[PDB]
Structures are given as C-alpha cells and as structure tokens.
Amino acid sequence: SVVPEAFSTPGWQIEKKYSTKVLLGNWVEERGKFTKAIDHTPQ
C-alpha cells in the first residue's frame, strides 16, 4: 500500500532548477536555513 505525498518531495525525475528567489517547486524548505541551538549537557 502506497502512502500519500505532497508536491516535489523526491526529485527522482529530472527537473530544471532555479534560484530560490523565484517562487518555484520546493522553494520554502531551502529558503529556510536549518537552525539548532544548545546550552550544555543536562543532568
């Protein structure tokens, strides 16, 4: 049984690629830089 997908997750088919300023396929997740922040090791 297959499970649902959104638009432009896999890219196993070959697509043309734009700079992410142009509002194209899979723009938002590459617009946002991945963020992390830690303070120390807890007890």
Partner: protein, 141 residues
C-alpha cells in the same frame, strides 16, 4: 576600497554575492505596494449602566428612574450591617468630615488616642486615600 556589506544570494535562508544595483528612474518599490500586501489608547463613548460618573442628587425626585447604585445588592438588603439598619450609609462613610469632627468622634466612640497617634492616623488615612479610611488605618496599624 570595497563596501562593508556583501549580501547573501539564494532566496531560501547562502553563499555571498554582491549587492545588485538598482538603476536611476527604475526604483518601483515606493510605488508598487499592493493594498492586499499592505493588508498583509482612545476615550470611551456612551453611558455606563451604573451612572457612577455623574454625581448623585441629594433629594431625589419621584420621577427619578436613572441607575445611581446607592441601592445595593439584595443580599445587602436582606442581611444588612447595623449602619444600614441604623440608617447611616456609605456616602456618610465617604464624606469629607472635619478635624474637629474626627476629634469628637475619637473620644466619644470609645477610643482613647494620643495626639501624635491621631496625627499619624490622619497621615496614614490621607496616604491610603487617593470614616472607612480612618477605621481601616486604625485597624491595620
């Protein structure tokens, strides 16, 4: 010899690139702001339902139907304080009396007070206010 600012490039949150120059008579930012994109403390008017802002009249007309408040809750009419049973009320509490009036109140209500204690009680009551005030200051201090 270069500017201190060199921008990111990719629209997504990039490797550096220079700031692109906007040529003269080609700045459309101040003119092309969509109202939808644009879409993307005060005094209070009317009457209150209690009419506490207007002063209360001394002798009421018969035709008086306005809401003043002096008529308290039905619980305060069914189990009144002895003041309300004796006919004295909260405007007689909150009225501005005199120094001689409070001095006559002190030695005749059953409280023996020093002169410095009376001056301190008046000072604490005036500090508590922006009888109830005198009784509250005497009870607290």
């Amino acid at each position: 010899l270069i500017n201190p600012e060199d921008i990111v490039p990719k629209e997504p949150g990039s490797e550096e690139t220079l700031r692109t120059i906007q040529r003269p008579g080609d700045k459309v930012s101040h003119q092309y702001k969509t109202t939808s994109s644009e879409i993307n403390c005060h005094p209070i008017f009317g009457v209150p339902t209690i009419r506490s802002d207007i002063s209360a009249p001394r002798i009421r007309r018969v035709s008086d139907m306005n809401n003043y408040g002096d008529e308290g809750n039905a619980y305060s009419l069914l189990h009144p304080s002895i003041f309300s049973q004796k006919g004295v009320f909260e405007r007689d509490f909150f009225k501005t009396r005199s120094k001689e009036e409070i001095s006559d109140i002190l030695t005749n209500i059953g409280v023996k007070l020093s002169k410095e204690e009376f001056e301190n009680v008046w000072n604490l009551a005036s500090k508590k206010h922006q009888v109830e005030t005198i009784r509250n200051v005497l009870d607290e201090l």
